[PDB]
Amino acid sequence: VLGGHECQPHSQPWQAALFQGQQLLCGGVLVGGNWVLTAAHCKKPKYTVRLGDHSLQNKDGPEQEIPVVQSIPHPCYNSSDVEDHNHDLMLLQLRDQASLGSKVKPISLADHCTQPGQKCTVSGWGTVTSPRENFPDTLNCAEVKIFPQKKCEDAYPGQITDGMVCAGSSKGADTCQGDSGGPLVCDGALQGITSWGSDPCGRSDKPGVYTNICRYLDWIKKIIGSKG
Ligand SMILES: [Ca+2]
């Protein structure tokens, strides 16, 4: 996350992180008591969901390691060709219900589709510098604005689907490597998942592209309540 800042600890209680021992892999979004929503391209045979964390270095207190008992990506995603990022969406079922409260909380799914110019936020432990990469110990947040789908399609010709949405900031705020899977939150609801973006990150030329959650509400709510 560039053009951002260290969030207030546990001000994003839905924030999750995918780990392999002590290597950060991707972000995550707590959607259910026993469900995490992340980017499909973060799939790996082996990872830990880590909830209620702020500083990787130090003990914050609301840390919950949680194993995954189901890796459910979108059935229209294809992890084969690097040029296509369509349906980059995955739900991960947790082994047990996460210990809920004010520092660990499921975020609600947006029941309306977005509009260009709408206030939104992104968060992650991804690198805050581009092109040279140094990574943050603490969770970083930043504010972004969702782009019009037409201007979205102009910065990435023939790369943007209706199941995507662009979010960006002139002022330098844009997710980067390490932030995939993390949340895009608009009006206290999850509207998108960090998918892919600009080289280098933070270019005013190129925004960030996010899975469009308001499009997949039926598929998510189906497996949030029929697989859960
Ligand atoms: Ca910690």
Residue numbers in the entry: 16 to 36, 38 to 67, 69 to 95, 95A, 95B, 95C, 96 to 125, 128 to 186, ...
Excerpt from the publication:
KLK8, formerly termed hK8, belongs to the 15 human kallikrein-related peptidases of the trypsin-like family S1A, with the MEROPS code S01.2445. KLK8 is secreted as an inactive pro-enzyme, whereby a signal peptide is cut off, followed by propeptide cleavage at the Lys15-Val16 bond, releasing active enzyme. As in most trypsin-like serine proteinases the KLK8 chain consists of two six-stranded β-barrels that can be considered as half-domains. At their interface the catalytic triad of Ser195, His57 and Asp102 is situated above the specificity subsites S4 to S4′, aligned from left to right in the standard orientation.
By contrast, the P21 form of KLK8-leup contains four copies of the aldehyde inhibitor leupeptin, with the sequence acetyl-Leu1i-Leu2i-Argininal3i. The P1-Arg3i aldehyde group in KLK8-leup is covalently linked to Ser195 Oγ as hemiacetal, with the oxygen occupying the oxyanion hole in the four KLK8 copies. Similar to a substrate, leupeptin forms a short antiparallel β-sheet with two backbone hydrogen bonds between P3-Leu1i and Gly216, and the amide of P1-Arg3i and the carbonyl oxygen of Ser214. The Arg3i side chain is buried in the S1 specificity pocket, which is rather hydrophobic in the upper region, whereas at the bottom the side-chains of Thr190, Ser217, Tyr228, and a water molecule bound to the Ser217 carbonyl O contribute to a polar environment. The negatively charged carboxylate of Asp189 forms a tight salt bridge to the positively charged Arg3i guanidyl group. The funnel-shaped S2 subsite of KLK8 is bordered by the hydrophobic side-chains of His57, His99, and partially Trp215, which explains very well the accommodation of the Leu2i side-chain of the inhibitor and the preference for the aliphatic Val and Leu residues in the substrate profiling. Also, the specific interactions of the P4 to P1 residues can be well explained on a structural level by the complex of KLK8 with the leupeptin inhibitor.
